[PDB]
């Protein structure tokens, strides 16, 4: 019995450890968020199927790593779901062929936010999975330890909803003028969703974000966002109603707004956060 990754990295007879480098494509699902499907990444086979049958389980102590360590979830093993990190050995998968066959493991994260996310840097450890292999022939009891690494920079969603982009940059026309902000949100199932803006504001109405341009800044102007032609104050819930699998545009537009005093030439920049909330 031996195993290999999609990229040819092998663990031989007797077990051992290997790194698995995965191009992650995490996604929200109903009730759980996919982190990584390893059934396309890890393969094993029985070396002598005519006389021996191999038994393969996911062993207790399999867990997330790095920045996913604070989160709990589920693991789907051979069509059934179990708590993850694993607290008990799973039922077995039978390996009875010399032909490589997937190790049927997929990792999920339990939603805890509305539309939050955890940023993963490429090269980061995201999970450690313990494959236990025994057989019906002798007393072999081997461990195949799979260290799962993110191959790419990615955001793992932690909520029931996800966004078109986690960072959006827009350029306004030269003062005066406006520009739409492309930003949509969708949810795995229907959610009563809203959002609020965050940032430093200049006015008592809490609706004009300050100009924080560092180099050659303009004076006298800030940035104000509108939705449906209506100014959106910061720290105030905008209701999107019920949001489902079809993406819904937040309908945001950026504008300049005078903050007082002389308007002098220079650069303008405002950094504005969006945070979603269940209502």
């Amino acid at each position: 019995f031996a195993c290999k990754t999609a990229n040819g990295t092998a663990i031989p007879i007797g077990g051992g450890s290997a790194n698995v480098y995965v191009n992650l494509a995490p996604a929200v699902n109903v009730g759980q968020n996919l982190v990584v499907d390893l059934s396309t990444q890890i393969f094993c086979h029985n070396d002598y199927p005519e006389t021996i049958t191999d038994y393969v389980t996911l062993q207790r102590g399999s867990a997330y790593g790095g920045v996913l360590s604070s989160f709990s979830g589920t693991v789907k093993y051979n069509g059934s779901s179990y708590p993850f990190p694993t607290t008990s050995e799973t039922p077995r998968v039978v390996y009875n062929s010399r032909t490589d066959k997937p190790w049927p493991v997929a990792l999920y994260l339990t939603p805890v936010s509305s539309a939050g996310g955890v940023a993963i840097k490429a090269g980061s450890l995201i999970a450690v999975l313990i494959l236990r292999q025994t057989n019906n022939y002798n007393s072999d009891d081997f461990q195949f330890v799979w260290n799962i690494y993110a191959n790419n920079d990615v955001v793992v969603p932690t909520g029931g909803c996800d966004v078109s982009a986690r960072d959006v940059t827009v350029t306004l026309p030269d003062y005066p003028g406006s520009v739409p902000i492309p930003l949509t949100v969708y949810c795995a199932k229907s959610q009563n969703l809203g959002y609020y803006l965050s940032g430093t504001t200049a006015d008592a109405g809490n609706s004009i974000f300050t100009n924080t341009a560092s180099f050659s800044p303009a004076q006298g102007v800030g940035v104000q966002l509108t939705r449906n032609g209506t100014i959106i104050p910061a720290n105030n819930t905008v209701s999107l109603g019920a949001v489902g699998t079809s993406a819904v545009s937040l309908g945001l537009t950026a504008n300049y707004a005078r903050t007082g005093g002389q308007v002098t030439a220079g650069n303008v920049q405002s950094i504005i956060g969006v945070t979603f909330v269940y209502q």
């Binding site: 350029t171 003062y175 940035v223």
Partner: peptide, 13 residues
């Protein structure tokens, strides 16, 4: 925040 929006602009003479 869930999403960070950066808005860039300029005031000309």
């Amino acid at each position: 925040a869930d999403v960070t929006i950066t808005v860039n602009g300029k005031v000309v003479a």
